[PDB]
């Protein structure tokens, strides 16, 4: 190596922004992507009260803020807040000016064009980066596993998408994007907790319900047997201490919250669960690469971290699939940061070094350059 | 005294985090124990059955050789008959 | 494989390989010194050709081994 510089592998995500320099093992700074203006009046003078706390600072003052995520389902709904989040990420969590570093954003499949074009326009005009490239969030997760084939189910917090890939040739007609993800599971858990008496309403208490979901919920291997067991014994009731005391006891809400993934009829969604959209995504592929996709099913994304999901999904697919094929589910322990590790690997490649969208190219063709050859 | 109390609260939170570490470590370790045992058993069985198939294949080789020789004999007989 | 292109490249390289001088502007001992230097040069040429011959031998050996080992997949 020598001259030259390092690339910034940012990964907007929806729920946790993960960033860091290319070539490492883990993102340098991981912090929730929330921007919360204060809502009360404020009487102390000279306290140095800011007008908007972003990132991990607003998870400590959340008692008097109104947190609001700037990314709803993959798409970005509030561009000013997203710009604020990016500015914070560059200047305070990494402390590297963007004028001297290429960036590699990530984007969900099948997203609106205007979102991607606005993203590149911001990165080139406001932050004024040298060159930026946008990559699909599933190809990176396939990089991180060290494979070159396989069908990856990247169940993030915003949107769950299922991109099949063979021998490096992506199959654009077999991408099945479903909008059920971690946020809907948080809302459903917050809605079923009311059956015991605990009411969480404020946008700050959604974070508490998210913590409950992360620490207690698990995916049942067989749903009916668990529903019958939890209704007779009491070996499942695990307690949890709120941020002020008054411990709560979660009964059969433990495995009913993440069960929504396999039965989206619980939250009123029509579509089939993540156990059947993978099989449908496979069956749309050609008849000769189905064995390889069956054997190399990859899990990624945060929401696939529930204890006991890699067995439930395998059981379901084995039920659906033909009896002869072998069904194997790759669930690496570093699931949460799989997309970012793959992004680092891709940015560190020499063959990839000429695919960046150089600034002079953007100046000649406008923001619509991203849809062109430089994808 | 107030400074000491602040120190105590800090120590309390750190102890909490440590116990949290302990629990998560134990859980992951038990998980990997399960996977280890299942993988090992299946590996054993797979090796066994594969070796069985290898033996049967060798037997088939010998059978095929016998049949080939006998076919040679019958062919010679038929051509002389012609 | 378009031997015209190979012939053009050969002409260029022979221009690179061209070492031609005067022939009737020296005395006897200078002629002998030039002949000795030319002999050393052609000795170097022989050495480089033998080195290339053994290198090509090793190339062919490794090509055969790699070809076999990639064929062994099936």
């Amino acid at each position: 190596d020598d001259e030259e510089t390092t690339a910034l592998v940012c990964d907007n995500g929806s729920g946790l922004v993960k960033a860091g320099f290319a070539g490492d093992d883990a993102p340098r700074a991981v912090f929730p992507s929330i921007v919360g203006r204060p809502r009360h009046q404020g009487v102390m003078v000279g306290m140095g009260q800011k007008d908007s706390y972003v990132g991990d600072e607003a998870q400590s003052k959340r008692g008097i803020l109104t947190l609001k995520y700037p990314i709803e389902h993959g798409i970005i709904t509030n561009w000013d807040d997203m710009e604020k989040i990016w500015h914070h990420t560059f200047y305070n969590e990494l402390r590297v000016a963007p004028e001297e570093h290429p960036t590699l954003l990530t984007e969900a499949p099948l997203n609106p064009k205007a979102n991607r074009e606005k993203m590149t326009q911001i990165m080139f005009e406001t932050f004024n980066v040298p060159a930026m490239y946008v990559a699909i969030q599933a190809v990176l997760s396939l990089y991180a596993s060290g494979r070159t084939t396989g069908i990856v189910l990247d169940s993030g917090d915003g949107v769950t998408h299922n991109v099949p890939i063979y021998e490096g040739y992506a199959l654009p007609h077999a991408i099945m994007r479903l909008d059920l993800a971690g946020r809907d599971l948080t809302d459903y858990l917050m809605k079923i907790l009311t059956e015991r008496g605990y009411s969480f309403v404020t946008t700050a208490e959604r974070e508490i319900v998210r913590d409950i979901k992360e620490k207690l919920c698990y995916v049942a291997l067989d749903f009916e047997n668990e529903m019958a067991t939890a209704a007779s014994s009491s070996s499942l009731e695990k307690s949890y201490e709120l941020p002020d005391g008054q411990v709560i006891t979660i009964g059969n809400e433990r495995f009913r919250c993440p069960e929504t993934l396999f039965q989206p009829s619980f939250i009123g969604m029509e579509s089939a669960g993540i156990h059947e959209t993978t099989y449908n995504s496979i069956m749309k592929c050609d008849i000769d690469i189905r064995k390889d996709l069956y054997a190399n099913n990859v899990l990624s994304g945060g929401t696939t971290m529930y204890p006991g999901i890699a067995d439930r999904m395998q059981k379901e697919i084995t039920a659906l699939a033909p009896s002869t094929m072998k069904i194997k589910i790759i669930a690496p322990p570093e699931r949460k940061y799989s997309v970012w590790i793959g992004g680092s690997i891709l940015a560190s490649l020499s063959t990839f070094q000429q695919m960046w969208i150089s600034k002079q190219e953007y100046d000649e063709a406008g923001p619509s350059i991203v849809h062109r050859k430089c994808f | 005294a107030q400074k000491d109390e602040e120190k105590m609260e800090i120590q309390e939170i750190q102890l909490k985090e440590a116990k949290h570490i302990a629990e998560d470590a134990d859980r992951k370790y038990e998980e990997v124990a399960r996977k280890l045992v299942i993988i090992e058993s299946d590996l054993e069985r797979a090796e066994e059955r594969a070796e069985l198939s290898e033996g049967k294949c060798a037997e088939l080789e010998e059978e095929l050789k016998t049949v080939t020789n006998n076919l040679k004999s019958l062919e010679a007989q038929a051509e002389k008959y012609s | 494989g378009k031997r015209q292109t190979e012939r053009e490249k050969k002409k260029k390289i022979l221009a690179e390989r061209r070492k031609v001088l005067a022939i009737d502007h020296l005395n006897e001992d200078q002629l002998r010194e030039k002949a000795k230097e030319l002999w050393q040069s052609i000795y170097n040429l022989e050495a480089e050709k033998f080195d290339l011959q053994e290198k090509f031998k090793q190339q062919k050996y490794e090509i055969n081994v790699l070809r076999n080992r990639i064929n062994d997949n099936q």
């Binding site: 990089y143 | - | 002629l31 000795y43 033998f50």
Partner: protein
Amino acid sequence: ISASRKLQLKTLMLQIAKQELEREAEERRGEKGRALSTRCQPLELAGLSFAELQDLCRQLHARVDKVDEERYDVEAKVTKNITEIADLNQKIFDLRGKFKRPTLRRVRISADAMMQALLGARAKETLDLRAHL
């Protein structure tokens, strides 16, 4: 039989192979020098006239250019061999690349060690807020 003894025997085998290979390498270099000296008939120009020496030098010039032609042919063959060598290396890389995607990289660099700076930042901000008041 036991792993340690077998590894010792393998190490002895590798060392004997390496020593015999070094011996053959020095033998090859010496034989190559001998053959290179043998190939050219030595030049003896003592007591030669202008015509004789000039014709000898001109013929040596022509033969040197012929040797250049021969080396050009051989080096074109060798360059095609280099191309196919690189192609075979690339093909083995492709055949091994089914699972070798995450292999060529560097991980566990910087962020693994720094953990207690966040606690220091929190303590510093709380202390600044308390001291300012």
